C-alpha cells in the first residue's frame, strides 16, 4: 500500500504493491496487460 522501488527476482520497477484477485498458474511469475507491460507479480518467498 506504499509507493516503493521493488525488485522481484530481478523484475525491477517502482509502484505501489497491492493484494490481487488474479490467480496465476503455478509456474507464472509476473503478469502483463494488453500493451505487454507488467501489472502483477508473484512474491517468491510466500507466493501470493
Amino acid at each position: 500500500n506504499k509507493c516503493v522501488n521493488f525488485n522481484f527476482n530481478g523484475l525491477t520497477g517502482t509502484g505501489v504493491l497491492t493484494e490481487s484477485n488474479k490467480k496465476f498458474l503455478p509456474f507464472q511469475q509476473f503478469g502483463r496487460d494488453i500493451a505487454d507491460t507488467t501489472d502483477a507479480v508473484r512474491d517468491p518467498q510466500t507466493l501470493e
Binding site: 509502484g15 496487460d33 494488453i34 500493451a35 507491460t37 501489472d39
Partner: peptide, 25 residues
Amino acid sequence: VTLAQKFNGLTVLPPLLTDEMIAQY
C-alpha cells in the same frame, strides 16, 4: 459507442464541457 498506459507517462484529460452540459446545450 464503446470506449493502464499511465505507468508509461500517458495521461487522458477531461473535456471542458461535461456530457450533461452538452445535453443541456
